[PDB]
Design an enzyme around this catalytic site. Sequence first.
Site, PDB file in Angstrom:
ATOM      1  N   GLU B  82      14.200  63.463  52.016  1.00 46.16           N
ATOM      2  CA  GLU B  82      14.886  62.843  53.130  1.00 46.16           C
ATOM      3  C   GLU B  82      13.946  62.069  54.031  1.00 46.16           C
ATOM      4  OE1 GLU B  82      18.463  66.254  53.705  1.00 46.16           O
ATOM      5  OE2 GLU B  82      17.059  65.822  55.334  1.00 46.16           O
ATOM      6  N   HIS B  89      10.510  64.202  54.642  1.00 46.18           N
ATOM      7  CA  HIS B  89      10.320  65.610  54.384  1.00 46.18           C
ATOM      8  C   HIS B  89      11.190  66.149  53.259  1.00 46.18           C
ATOM      9  CE1 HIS B  89      13.942  65.498  56.674  1.00 46.18           C
ATOM     10  NE2 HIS B  89      13.317  65.206  57.803  1.00 46.18           N
ATOM     11  N   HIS B  91      13.263  68.625  51.314  1.00 44.30           N
ATOM     12  CA  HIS B  91      14.027  69.860  51.494  1.00 44.30           C
ATOM     13  C   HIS B  91      14.023  70.551  50.149  1.00 44.30           C
ATOM     14  CE1 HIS B  91      15.565  68.858  55.390  1.00 44.30           C
ATOM     15  NE2 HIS B  91      16.537  69.755  55.344  1.00 44.30           N
ATOM     16  N   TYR B 153      25.322  70.979  53.182  1.00 43.54           N
ATOM     17  CA  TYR B 153      24.445  70.255  54.090  1.00 43.54           C
ATOM     18  C   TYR B 153      23.571  69.186  53.452  1.00 43.54           C
ATOM     19  CZ  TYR B 153      25.542  74.042  57.448  1.00 43.54           C
ATOM     20  OH  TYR B 153      26.093  74.971  58.305  1.00 43.54           O
TER      21      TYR B 153
END
Lengths: 193, 193, 193, 193, 193
Positions: B82, B89, B91, B153
């Site tokens: 992302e 960063h 995830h 998410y």
Amino acid sequence: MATFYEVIVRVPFDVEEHLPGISDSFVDWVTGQIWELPPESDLNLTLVEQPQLTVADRIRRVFLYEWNKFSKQESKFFVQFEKGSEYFHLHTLVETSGISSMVLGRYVSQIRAQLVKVVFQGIEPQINDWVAITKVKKGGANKVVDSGYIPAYLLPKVQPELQWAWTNLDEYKLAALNLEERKRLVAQFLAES
Amino acid sequence: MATFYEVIVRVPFDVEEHLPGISDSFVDWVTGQIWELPPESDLNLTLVEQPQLTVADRIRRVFLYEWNKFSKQESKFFVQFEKGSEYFHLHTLVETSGISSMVLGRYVSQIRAQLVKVVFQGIEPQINDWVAITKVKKGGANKVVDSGYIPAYLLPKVQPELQWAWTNLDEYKLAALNLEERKRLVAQFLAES
Amino acid sequence: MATFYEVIVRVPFDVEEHLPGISDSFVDWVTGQIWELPPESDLNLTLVEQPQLTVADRIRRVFLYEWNKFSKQESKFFVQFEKGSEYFHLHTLVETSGISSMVLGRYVSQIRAQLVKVVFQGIEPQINDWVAITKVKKGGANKVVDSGYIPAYLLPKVQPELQWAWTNLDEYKLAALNLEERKRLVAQFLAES
Amino acid sequence: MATFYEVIVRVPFDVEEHLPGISDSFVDWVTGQIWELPPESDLNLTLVEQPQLTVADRIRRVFLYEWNKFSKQESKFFVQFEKGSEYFHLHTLVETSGISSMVLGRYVSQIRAQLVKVVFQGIEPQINDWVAITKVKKGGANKVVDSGYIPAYLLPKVQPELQWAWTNLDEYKLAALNLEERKRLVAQFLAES
Amino acid sequence: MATFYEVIVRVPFDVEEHLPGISDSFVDWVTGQIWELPPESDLNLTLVEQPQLTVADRIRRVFLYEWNKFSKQESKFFVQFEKGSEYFHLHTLVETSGISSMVLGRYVSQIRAQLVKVVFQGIEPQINDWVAITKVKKGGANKVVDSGYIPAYLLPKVQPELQWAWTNLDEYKLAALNLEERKRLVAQFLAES
DNA sequence: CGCGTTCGCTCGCTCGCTGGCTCGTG
DNA sequence: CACGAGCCAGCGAGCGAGCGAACGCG
């Protein structure tokens, strides 16, 4: 392939402080020996403690000599004289061929005894572990590294830390006393990995 | 059922600003790596910062690899690269299978150190917490979620925020790089609840 | 700079209550040792429990001696014999040089065992943790302080709490047994900060 | 001065309803324990639920025992067994000496776990908060009262509400099981204020 | 009391997969051995992989024998041949009596070397860790359990997982090959605790 | 209460030590 | 030869980052 053992020897540079009882013929000998940088070199001779080097050289000679007696052959090697925070010490790399790790140390104690008798006229240098075998760890076995160790940890050294080098290993005969040659191989090495 | 830990890694982008001292071979590497969208994808490759992705990928690889060394298995995962307001960063979601929450870090951190030696050639990224384990709160436990966390998410994200994704988890192998497939599962999820 | 470890040893004062089984030659030894205050001192010898001090000193001596065997050098130190609500205890401060935090414990352990065989003729003192290393917190790292620790927490002590002191650290050689010299440095310290 | 922490434990009085799964040896133990009022007492033994008291006693013993392991000393205390509208509950008052307000919990939690294993044979009492630390308020900090708390709130209690008591605190060793002694100190207290 | 060490050994049940190079005389030996259930037994011999059991037995014998050579006595034991998801493995428990945890491994190893020479005619079984000692935890000391471990973890086993058992420990001589005797002691154990 | 700060306990990693072999020398 | 120094795998106390409930002020 080529595998090597590492034996570090500290150079007792000071006469009385390290070798109490030594005669003068010794002190005169180390002095009556002038070092000269070969053509292909490029080192700053001003940064080469000659008095010590003269001793370190004798050490190295007797060592290799006495060693080849065991290996029963011409052992490929690579000695590098270094000067550190504590004192001068010869980094020596001989090829294992002929000396089983189980008995290396029984031989080094033969060479150490010899250095004393020849180089220091039967005088035990008052230095702690002046001839120590590189182990994998304390209580570990004799380390043993490959050719790669030379450009990896030995070559990168630069004066004043670096003082001198020797080696019958062709691949590094020029890298011995030439910061330029070294820098090259040292780079090459960091690449091919 | 399948439970996962979340480890967020910030992917450095400015060789100097974040990795001072890094050689050139690195800068050339991240550059000499061209990314191409697989057939089933539908993402706007123009909105995918390739130079960073190149780094994020390597991080991802080494992380997973080193991680399976602990899990003693083929840990099911789902990494999503992302790009946010602060910086890029990764995830990462790995299955707990084999890693106790009490000893998560010791291993996680064992990895961090690895990433440095391998990816950034022993250079400590000047980024605050570039490898943070997701905590349920302050002084809390290592948050551990289930599969549902991905569509809940992670999937909803769309370019430019979304840059790429990985996963050996069949159920989402197409949702990885396909905004369409995602929108589907994302909707489905919101439904069955 | 100079960094130190702290090893607190509780000196077992009551012969029978702490060292059950000890011979008489011991009890006689601690007694047949008369302490005298050096010229430069200014302490009230009346407040200096000589019997304990005799033991604390022996402890101190062996400790240091055995310690230098490890450090491979003349470790700078500062030992302060204190008397508290519970029992007497030697505050020892040795320089870290030579003992990597990791192994500090296996070194003090050997010493502890040495103190028993030499000082207490192999009799295990019946005192809880009579040799304990200072940690920065339960489970924390071996607390390592700098010279400043001395005037900051050790010098301010005054009889009867203070009993004696030792040190090869010139900067405090006079502060050792002089409440006046102390007060001086103690003040200077609180100023320059 | 003497400061105390207050931990209220709910003594599980219904073998089945509260401790489902417990063996018989337990039910037989509580029964095979007859209580007798010491000479100086004056309590109506008829109003003393022996079976519960037998459990409450065990609880109190293990509690204090385990607790002294922490405080590293003979902690002054005052346990009062009460019988209320909901259920029996030991009012325990131990001295803070040794247990900080930021760790009282972790230490009681351990005790609780111990009570279960020893007293209830690894059976978790089905009683809501059977081991609560008295706070200043909800969300407040661990409360701590002085000696005055005993005659102020504990002593006034009279049978059947009052069941028994304990205390190594001399000043109240007679007030423990004597409604007369209590009424005196209880009086004196209300006066000197 | 009786304390035991635990040495787990796999069972190289494959001539072309685990013992490459082995002769035929071996393959013929393991075959020319027919197992029979003793009278007091009650196991389903159909569920007892005889070929593996023949090897597992030889292993056990040589092990015990060689071991008593060290223990200088008749070491009480309890071997249980098991069959798992990966492979067959002899659970061995020998009494510490005579083998200081310090030399366990150095000795076991001598045994391992002996198994190879005797049982597998100098052929190293291509099995990862086919002779492992069990330790409390990494960095911990060698696990040493008491008699209770047998009924606690060993006896509960039932075919096909259980394959056989041995032991000169009277208390379990019958529980060895009898699922009924086991179920009894297994029950009794769970009770007296 | 929520939420950020303590701080006793957990538990894989380190690295000097143990103590049974090994093998050349006197 | 037997010793006995040199060897070194196996050992495990000691260590110290981490973790997370306990706590308790805004």
